[PDB]
Paper text:
B. miyamotoi encodes two separate bbk32 orthologs denoted fbpA and fbpB; however, the activities of these proteins are unknown. The crystal structures presented here of FbpA-C and FbpB-C show that a defining feature of the C1r-binding domains for BBK32 and B. miyamotoi Fbps is a four-helix core with an extended second alpha helix that presents a functional arginine residue on a small surface-loop.
However, we noted that the area near BBK32-K327 involves a minor structural alteration in FbpA-C and a more major alteration in FbpB-Δ5C. More strikingly, the structure of FbpB-Δ5C has a significantly altered secondary structure in this region when compared to both FbpA-C and BBK32-C. Specifically, FbpB-Δ5C shows a loss of secondary structure within alpha helix 5 that accommodates a loop insertion sequence (i.e., residues Q394-Q405), which are not conserved in both BBK32-C or FbpA-C. Furthermore, a proline residue (P397) in this sequence interrupts the alpha helical secondary structure in FbpB-Δ5C. A portion of this unique loop structure in FbpB has apparent increased disorder in the crystal structure, indicated by weak electron density surrounding residues 401-403 in this region of the protein. Interestingly, although BBK32-K327 is not conserved in FbpB, this did not preclude high-affinity interaction with activated C1r-CCP2-SP. FbpB-C blocked complement activation but, surprisingly, was ~80-fold less potent than FbpA (IC50 = 1,900 nM) despite having similar high affinity for activated C1r-CCP2-SP. Unlike BBK32/FbpA, FbpB fails to interact with zymogen forms of human C1r but instead selectively binds and inhibits the activated form.
Residue numbers in the entry: 269 to 354, 356 to 400, 404 to 426
Write the structure that this text describes.
């Protein structure tokens, strides 16, 4: 029950984090077709497809996504404390590290929200691409939650 509580929330966090990461993939893919000077020549129709896809993404979508991710991380923390207090001669260090990584994620995701809200582009250009630090910061949560999941799966 308590284990399901923690692991269900982590799974919900993982899902949004994976989304963010996939969203970066989509934007990069189509942006490179639209780029006047970078990447491989695309046909006019790929370029038109790119404009329409890129219009599905905005600064607000990204902020909303991060706020949702942060909420699931904070429910993950809470569930982690319950599981932690519920000691049998000593806490598993797997449990401790999970909580530790989660605490790290929370500040890192909060920081990224504060960072992104002051971007000036409202369109897809609020999303950084790798062609840079922020690009990496945005997809780090998936890795760390992938470790949180791994640690609680015994």
């Amino acid at each position: 029950f308590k284990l399901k509580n923690i692991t269900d929330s982590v799974e919900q966090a993982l899902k949004i984090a994976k989304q963010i990461k996939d969203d970066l993939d989509i934007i990069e893919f189509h942006r490179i077709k639209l780029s006047n000077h970078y990447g491989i020549r695309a046909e006019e129709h790929e370029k038109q497809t790119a404009r329409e896809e890129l219009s599905k993404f905005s600064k607000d979508k990204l902020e909303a996504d991060l706020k949702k991710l942060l909420s699931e991380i904070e429910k993950s923390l809470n569930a982690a404390t319950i599981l932690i207090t519920y000691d049998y001669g000593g806490n598993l260090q797997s449990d401790l590290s999970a909580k530790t990584t989660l605490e790290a994620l929370k500040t890192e995701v909060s920081s990224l929200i504060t960072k992104i809200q002051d971007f000036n582009n409202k369109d897809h250009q609020a999303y950084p691409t790798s062609y840079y630090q922020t690009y990496q910061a945005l997809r780090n949560p998936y890795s760390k939650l992938t470790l949180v999941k791994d640690l609680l799966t015994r």
